[PDB]
Specification:
The complex is a heterodimer of chains A (about 5) and B (about 900).
Chain A: no helix or strand
Chain B: H1 4-14, H2 23-49, E1 65-66, E2 73-78, E3 84-89, E4 96-99, H3 115-127, E5 138-143, H4 147-156, E6 161-163, H5 172-177, E7 180-183, H6 192-201, E8 206-209, H7 218-226, E9 230-231, H8 250-259, H9 264-272, E10 285-287, E11 290-292, H10 299-318, H11 330-345, H12 356-365, H13 388-391, E12 400-405, E13 411-419, E14 425-430, E15 436-441, E16 468-470, E17 476-478, E18 484-491, E19 498-504, E20 511-514, H14 521-533, E21 538-543, E22 546-551, H15 552-563, H16 567-585, H17 597-605, H18 613-616, E23 622-626, E24 635-636, E25 641-643, H19 652-660, H20 681-694, H21 705-715, H22 721-729, H23 739-757, H24 765-779, H25 782-785, H26 808-821, H27 826-831, H28 838-845, E26 855-858, E27 869-872
Parallel strand pairs in B: 4-8, 5-6, 5-7, 7-8, 20-21, 22-23, 23-25
Antiparallel strand pairs in B: 1-9, 2-3, 3-4, 10-11, 12-19, 13-18, 14-17, 14-19, 15-16, 15-18, 21-22, 24-25, 26-27
The chains are: A little secondary structure (about 5), B alpha/beta (about 900).
The complex binds a molecule of 2 linked components (A2G-GAL) and zinc ion.
GO cellular component, one term (chain B): extracellular space
EC number (chain B): 3.4.24.-
Family (chain B): Belongs to the peptidase M88 family.
Chain lengths: ~5, ~900
């Protein structure tokens, strides 16, 4: 996944 | 009297800086400590690095692993963007090393070049000498990460470990025969952080590999704490992708690791007083009276460096750690006491040009406040913030017990007590339930220290302390250099739940808490007496869902000038004219307060839910700051929002700002175009009430009926009459453009509703009804409720966009006004140049309502509706009916 900016 | 050298020695054990004034002496001591630490680091790092490649790339899926105490911990690998990718620990006399990724599985590939330097690191771990071989088959225990991959990892580095075949984390005897403990985030243990600290202190050397990519790890955070390290902020290295390139020289790496966390050049500058006299202040820009200097070259980097010191120290404040009760904290202690000494000498006001040295050192010392301690010192001069009343506030020698409601799941709320300057306070939480709590001091927003304005560095930069974590049934001791209003910060709470607060050593500022429906006659008289005693510089008022944190002299100023000394009427109008008016206009479920009869009847005739707490629950606490200065301008929006003139229940700015926190996108015309328009119904309605209740005519020219008329007759001449009026009225993206002309639209419907009900007192009910409607559209179960709401044709709940290029606000307003008036209101939307989507036109069509022919309500005053004239706009444009 990816961190939420 | 003692000497400042004797004072400082005694202050270092206890934290009592009350008599400490020689800051150059404390700064000489810090300089001596920093150089010792730097010499030790440079020996260790030189041995570790030798001349091997510094190349190290942990990738995006990795975490930053940071030092904490500079005397025990230091970076190992700093990337080119300055992120610490790995840290060395010597906490509690042990030896430890932590990587933000599992470097052991990458030595045969993506980080092959790091393998020789890792060999030296393990040799330093195992033997304390980076250049001393490990013994063949030395015993390695691997816990929380795959043992085979880790051991082959070490074999890839040229080591020859043997599997200890036991858990040296939890099994003490394994630890006394293992030579190294490798840890990852799969570990299991009771007291995971204390156990790690204990194996480290007994001499087991520990290598920690983060195993969860860029995710945080609760287990990893506990392991890091045991080593005296901490996990990086959320997201890790995902965005920055920091790394150490081949181009990195040992010398450069040694220089950064020697300096990290102790900014040697700043210590030198403090010792020498060599502050800058050449900042190009001409590059500062003002904005509504607020000077900033983010474009003065060099200033931002100086600011960033000071922020780093503040972050490092506040990490302890937030964990409720008292550096003066922790071993091996000399550097930190020195930093804190030097700042306490500078605070003895501060004199106000200072100017960034006339007073560069005092300005720049103060700027540094303001960022270094240690709050968790048994003793400390008061700053002599409190400037624009407070004065002799705050200094001399009396404090309670015995434990006070307060019960506090937490109205929402998360926020903060005033405890009702103050820390007095330099006087030890002890606070304890009990009966918390599941709520997580923290204590904080003051509510100033940082923009309200106007230190860049000419001669306005007249108060501390950081009057609001960091949030200090409280664990249930554990006391914490605080000393504040400034004094402040005590806040309770909470999350994960149950709305309506209570907490118990026990506190010793706190002052009692004037405090008024009123709750809708109860006997406040005693609380009000208590409060008037405290005001009359004139013992405090700060006060607080909790009324319903509104908390006012206020400078006393500002509020007494407002009570003397606008209320003639009558505190009682001031409070009644604060509650009723200002707070209740707005929240009633917005149709919130106010306790013990029924809806007016014409609202109840409309809601019943429509089969609407206008009373349930689930749909119309009051929002959380609205906070208001009344201070000498604001975050921005003379008043800044938000929660809290700021004002500087005082506090005037009838004031326009009071209801404008409260209005902003009550705005909803589906009642805005063209989105942000109505950003300073749709909240205006709250000051407007207040002024109409004020003229009819009290006979006072306030702000009677705000609504520009005449000019909106002019822009309308012009635009409708175009071949696209809508797009015509639009570009005169709503196109302008200026954040306050056409503000009084756009307000005329919103009041159009008040006059219309008043006529439609044949009652001049009911006109404002239309906005309450739209507010009730809007919340049902927003929250009610769609399929079961869209019919009664006038949304039957919509398969899905409509959108909530605030963008000016969206129809979502135009649509809802058209539908809601058409449903409520039971007339098609598209002619008048077009007349104002309000474009609505084809789905919303489809919906209004399906109402089968008689068209309301385009109308316009005109007036020569804002607040007096008795002179309003209705214009039929369907067959051309009549003349302005005044005179
Ligand atoms: C981004 O959205 C995320 C949801 O996918 C997430 O809510 C994240 O908030 C972070 O969550 C972390 C735990 O997973 C921590 O609580 C962290 O402090 C928190 O920021 C969102 N990040 C932000 C702040 O935009
Ligand atoms: Zn505004």
């Amino acid at each position: 996944e990816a961190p939420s900016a | 009297m003692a000497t400042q050298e004797e004072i400082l020695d005694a202050a270092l054990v206890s934290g009592d800086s009350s008599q400490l004034t020689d800051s150059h002496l404390v700064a000489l001591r810090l300089q001596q400590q920093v150089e010792r630490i730097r010499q030790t680091r440079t020996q260790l790092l030189d041995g570790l690095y030798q001349n091997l490649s510094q190349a190290y790339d942990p990738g995006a899926a990795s975490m930053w692993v940071l030092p904490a105490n500079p005397d025990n911990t230091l970076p190992f690998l700093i990337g080119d963007k300055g992120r610490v990718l790995a840290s060395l620990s010597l906490e509690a006399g042990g030896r430890g090393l932590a990587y933000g990724t599992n470097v052991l599985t990458q030595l045969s590939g993506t980080n092959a070049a790091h393998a020789p330097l890792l060999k030296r690191a393990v040799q330093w771990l195992v033997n304390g000498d980076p250049g001393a071989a490990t013994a063949k088959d030395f015993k390695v225990s691997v816990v929380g990460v795959d043992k085979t991959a880790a051991l082959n990892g070490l074999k890839s580095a040229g080591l020859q470990p043997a599997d200890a075949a036991c858990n040296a984390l939890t099994d003490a005897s394994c630890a006394s025969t293992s030579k190294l403990l490798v840890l990852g985030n799969g570990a299991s243990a009771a007291s995971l952080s204390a156990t790690v600290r204990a194996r480290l202190q007994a001499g087991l050397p520990i290598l920690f590999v983060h195993t969860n990519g860029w995710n945080q790890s609760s287990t990893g955070q506990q392991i890091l704490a045991g080593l005296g390290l901490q996990e990086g902020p959320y997201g890790g290295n995902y965005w920055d992708k920091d790394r150490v390139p081949s181009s990195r020289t040992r010398t450069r790496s040694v220089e950064l690791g020697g300096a990290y966390g102790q900014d040697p050049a700043l210590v030198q500058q403090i010792v020498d007083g060599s502050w800058r006299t050449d900042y190009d202040w001409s590059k500062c820009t003002s904005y509504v009276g607020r000077t900033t200097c983010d474009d003065v070259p060099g200033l931002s980097d100086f600011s960033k460096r000071v922020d780093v010191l503040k972050g490092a120290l506040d990490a302890y404040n937030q964990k409720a750690q008292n550096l003066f009760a922790l071993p091996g904290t000399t550097s930190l202690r020195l930093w804190l006491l030097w700042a306490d000494a500078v605070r003895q000498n501060i004199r106000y006001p200072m100017d960034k040009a006339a007073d560069t040295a005092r300005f720049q050192e103060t700027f540094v010392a303001d960022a270094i406040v240690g709050y968790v301690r048994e003793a400390g010192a008061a700053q002599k001069e409190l400037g624009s913030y407070a004065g002799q009343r705050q200094q001399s506030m009396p404090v309670s020698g015995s434990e006070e017990t307060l019960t506090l409601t937490l109205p929402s799941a998360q926020g903060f709320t005033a405890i009702g007590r103050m820390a007095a300057p330099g006087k030890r306070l002890s606070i304890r939480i009990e009966d918390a339930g599941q709520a997580s709590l923290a204590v904080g001091l003051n509510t100033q927003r940082i923009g309200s220290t106007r230190l860049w304005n000419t001669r306005q560095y007249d108060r501390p930069r950081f009057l609001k302390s960091p949030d200090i974590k409280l664990q249930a049934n554990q006391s914490v001791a605080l000393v504040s250099p400034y004094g402040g209003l005590l806040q309770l910060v909470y999350s994960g709470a149950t709305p309506g739940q209570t907490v118990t607060v026990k506190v010793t050593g706190a002052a009692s500022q004037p405090f008024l808490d009123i709750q809708p429906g109860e006997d406040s006659s005693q609380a009000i008289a208590d409060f008037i007496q405290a005001l009359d005693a004139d013992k405090a510089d700060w006060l607080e008022i909790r009324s319903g869902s509104v908390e006012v944190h206020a400078k006393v002299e500002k509020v007494r100023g407002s009570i003397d000038k606008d209320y003639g000394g009558d505190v009682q009427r001031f409070i009644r109008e604060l509650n009723e004219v200002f707070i209740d008016d707005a929240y009633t206009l917005a149709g919130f479920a106010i306790p013990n307060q029924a809806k007016t009869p014409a609202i109840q009847q409309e809601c019943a005739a429509r089969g609407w839910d206008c009373d349930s707490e689930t749909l119309h629950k009051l929002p959380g606490t609205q906070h208001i700051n009344v201070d000498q200065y604001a975050q921005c301008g003379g008043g800044c929006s938000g929660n809290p929002y700021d004002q500087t003139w005082g506090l005037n229940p009838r004031g326009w700015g009071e209801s404008h700002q409260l209005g902003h926190n009550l705005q909803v996108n589906r009642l805005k015309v063209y989105g942000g175009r109505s950003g300073e328009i749709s909240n205006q119904i709250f000051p407007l309605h207040k002024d109409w009430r004020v003229l009819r209740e009290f006979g006072q005519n306030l702000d009677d020219t705000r609504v520009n009926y005449r000019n909106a008329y002019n822009l309308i007759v012009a635009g409708r001449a175009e071949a696209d009459p809508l797009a015509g009026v639009y570009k005169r009225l709503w196109e302008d993206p200026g954040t306050y453009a056409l503000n009084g002309e756009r307000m005329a639209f919103y009041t159009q419907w008040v006059h219309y509703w008043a006529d439609l009900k044949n009652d001049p007192l009911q006109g404002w009910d239309i906005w309450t009804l739209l507010y009730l409607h809007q919340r049902q559209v927003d929250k009610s179960d769609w399929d079961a409720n869209k019919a009664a709401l006038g949304y039957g044709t919509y398969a899905q709940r409509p959108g909530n966009s605030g963008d000016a290029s969206s129809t979502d606000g135009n649509d809802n307003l058209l539908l809601g006004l058409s449903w409520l008036t039971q007339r098609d209101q598209r002619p008048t939307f077009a007349l104002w140049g309000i474009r609505t989507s084809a789905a919303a036109q489809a919906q209004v069509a399906a109402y089968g309502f008689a068209e309301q022919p385009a109308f316009f309500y005109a007036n020569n005053r804002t607040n007096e509706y008795s002179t309003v004239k209705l214009l039929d706009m369907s067959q051309g444009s009549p003349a302005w009916p005044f005179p």
